[PDB]
Amino acid sequence: MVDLKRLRQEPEVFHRAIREKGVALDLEALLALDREVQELKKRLQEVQTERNQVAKRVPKAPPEEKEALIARGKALGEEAKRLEEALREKEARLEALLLQVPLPPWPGAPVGGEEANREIKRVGGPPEFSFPPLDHVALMEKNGWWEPRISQVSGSRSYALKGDLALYELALLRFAMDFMARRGFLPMTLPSYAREKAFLGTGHFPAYRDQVWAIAETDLYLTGTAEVVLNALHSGEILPYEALPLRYAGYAPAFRSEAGSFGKDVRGLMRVHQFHKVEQYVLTEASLEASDRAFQELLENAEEILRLLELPYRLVEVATGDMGPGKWRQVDIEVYLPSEGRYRETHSCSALLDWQARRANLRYRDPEGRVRYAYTLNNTALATPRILAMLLENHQLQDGRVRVPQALIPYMGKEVLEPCG
Amino acid sequence: MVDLKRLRQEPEVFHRAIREKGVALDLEALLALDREVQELKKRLQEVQTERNQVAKRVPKAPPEEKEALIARGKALGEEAKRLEEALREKEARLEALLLQVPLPPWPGAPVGGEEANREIKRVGGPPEFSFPPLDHVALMEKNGWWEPRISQVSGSRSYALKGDLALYELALLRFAMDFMARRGFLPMTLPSYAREKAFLGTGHFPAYRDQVWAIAETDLYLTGTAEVVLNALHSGEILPYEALPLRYAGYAPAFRSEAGSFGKDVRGLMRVHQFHKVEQYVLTEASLEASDRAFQELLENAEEILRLLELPYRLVEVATGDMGPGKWRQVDIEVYLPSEGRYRETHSCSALLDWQARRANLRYRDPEGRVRYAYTLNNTALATPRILAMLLENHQLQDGRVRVPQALIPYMGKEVLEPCG
């Protein structure tokens, strides 16, 4: 959500954001709907104002006149209800439209969709193999590291790991949490379900409603990211200025409903229904300089995890059509997947200004004792099983066995993943 | 599912077990429907026999007695239909109540409800405090180790952990997987959703359908235990004799809908909708000796985890009325909670013989080349957050901070859990 006041005194800006972000919103019809709601509230107070006057003098009008007063009361009642009923209808139609208004992107954002995205930097390279590499599926198959029978049990777009690779999944999530804690973020372990209110908060509702799995016969939904929970914990509080910035490293299982059959079809570990993700969340003050400082920290944290993991990556500046309605800036980190000769997204670093804070009601008391809407940022720390695709391929030995990066040896208890079952 | 042969030749046994386990099942009506269905099938075969036999003679027939043959053949036809149709209705219905038939309890199980449960043995002492012990809620509240705001985001029977306790949850989950892996069990990380077939396989459906959340607009349900997924893997395969026993240690987040209103105060870390659980599962040969040896191992693993964890525990034989329909034996392990002044269950060790093997279709080839239904067993290795409640209360120090058992210091890095706020 955006400031409505500013929506009417500067709609040109918001028109540019709607066009450039490819949002399917008619600004002008919104603004018109807004002036319906507004005229109606005025005429509705009027009618109850008249009715007040009538009701005052009903007894201690003569019997001769009090009858007329009653007739004017009833007709005013007809009015008040008729008017109120239309205002209601209109207000909720406005509220829905207002939940779609995009935040303007930062001035340097590439204009266009996915094609317009721009490579910032690249750190590292595709490994040079003294033997022809295997892909991650073939490595799993060979070493007995996953269970294909899971498909009959749970369905498509599902995975079960086994032997040393099951342990390696758990080692990676512990490693990400310890790394985060040592960087001053507050480590939390969280549930994977939430009420709708928490999804409106982040802007996953309404725009990405189709990506989410509902729990039948409840008012709960399964979450795609710990960001849904982390963002709603402080909803309705006025945080002290000295709390800021709030730095949260939240772990939770995550769930996704779909995506229209995959961009290198369906599977491996690449696109699955259920996964594990450690997210970084930042709640800061309503300045651009504090948002910019936080953005650079979240980014460097992800870069540092990839360096410790010994992975080749690159940073990419995300274009206006690819960002989302609520983003000011987004930089993606992509890792090299040798089997597909391609960089593949592993992290996504976003600055949302006060677009989520206006919808989730997150506020602080500034240094001058003014109550403001805070600024929110987020990035991934580590999600499994997607990085296991990259680790296996980049670190495969002639054998088909896999090397464990140095920083991960204390967590595994070994230098080499071994074949199982 | 039980063997209908054994059922037909020993209903004495199944009747005793229906009432001993408090099963809402009329055995006479079941045995009635069985006979009806068998006689119908016999008859339908006699008709099909003569119906065809007749026609072979109808080609070759003196006009004289071709009337006789059309007559008899048409009557046979009309009857084949009524038999086909009746056998539809009944065979369907007999299936529905074969699924309710209970396995007989082991001879030595106490008869009666939850009251008839019998302490076998208790190991170790309640802790001796040089100060007034706090309960687990007061220790988390004092040290800022839980996020009370989670109730607004996710409703009640939610928890969110912070700081050193969040890390401690992840450490225990990895400890249990390492312990299990060192004990010859095969480690796996699994989904938390499965198709209906997997739930019928275990006996969760139809008896405990109430305890299970469904993912709306889908054929998937969330699992309350890794057993549901573990038991459906080898469904429909004939395992070779040399593969046996299968020992699996599965990890998965677990969900419960809590159609479980309460008794009197349990509302801290005790009855949450979402938790993490490492399960022991054994698939063995159809021998009692083999079941009992597996049962003993499964229990010793759990006793050893509790010793490693420095917790006082007891063993309880579960009564016939508290087992559930599929069990032969059930032994609960319970841990001392100082604030309540009593033992609360942490582990539950079950032997199901071939009751779930007949539902899930799990089979092996025995040493003589005959194909048999396998025997299954299961037990918790470690579940969080319920074990944390016991760890905090038993390991609390004077200052309100909590000691880490020797076995876990390598998983934590520290010897004592530190407050955050």
Swiss-Prot record, chains A, B:
| Enzyme Commission number(s) of this protein | 6.1.1.11
- According to the UniProt record, what class of enzyme is this? ligase
Q: Which GO terms describe its biological process?
A: selenocysteine biosynthetic process; seryl-tRNA aminoacylation
Residues reported in the UniProt entry to bind L-serine:
T225, A226, E227, E279, T380
Query: Which keywords accompany this UniProt record?
Result: Aminoacyl-tRNA synthetase, ATP-binding, Cytoplasm, Ligase, Nucleotide-binding, Protein biosynthesis
Q: Which GO terms describe its molecular function?
A: ATP binding; identical protein binding; protein homodimerization activity; serine binding; serine-tRNA ligase activity; tRNA binding
> Where is this protein primarily located?
cytoplasm
Please name one Pfam family that this protein belongs to.
Seryl_tRNA_N
Task: Enumerate the residues binding ATP.
Answer: R256, S257, E258, V272, E345, T346, H347, S348
**Cellular component GO terms held in the UniProt record:** cytoplasm
Q: In which pathway does it act?
A: Aminoacyl-tRNA biosynthesis; selenocysteinyl-tRNA(Sec) biosynthesis; L-seryl-tRNA(Sec) from L-serine and tRNA(Sec): step 1/1
Q: Catalytic activity, per the record? A: tRNA(Ser) + L-serine + ATP = L-seryl-tRNA(Ser) + AMP + diphosphate + H(+); tRNA(Sec) + L-serine + ATP = L-seryl-tRNA(Sec) + AMP + diphosphate + H(+)
Provide the protein's localization.
Cytoplasm
Q: Function of this protein?
A: Catalyzes the attachment of serine to tRNA(Ser). Is also probably able to aminoacylate tRNA(Sec) with serine, to form the misacylated tRNA L-seryl-tRNA(Sec), which will be further converted into selenocysteinyl-tRNA(Sec).
Protein family (similarity comment): Belongs to the class-II aminoacyl-tRNA synthetase family. Type-1 seryl-tRNA synthetase subfamily.
Cross-referenced NCBIfam families: serS
| Subunit text | Homodimer. A single tRNA molecule binds across the dimer.
Checking HAMAP family in the record gives: Ser_tRNA_synth_type1 (MF_00176)
Q: What is known of its domains?
A: Consists of two distinct domains, a catalytic core and a N-terminal extension that is involved in tRNA binding.
The name of this protein is Serine--tRNA ligase
Give the organism, scientific name: Thermus thermophilus (strain ATCC BAA-163 / DSM 7039 / HB27)
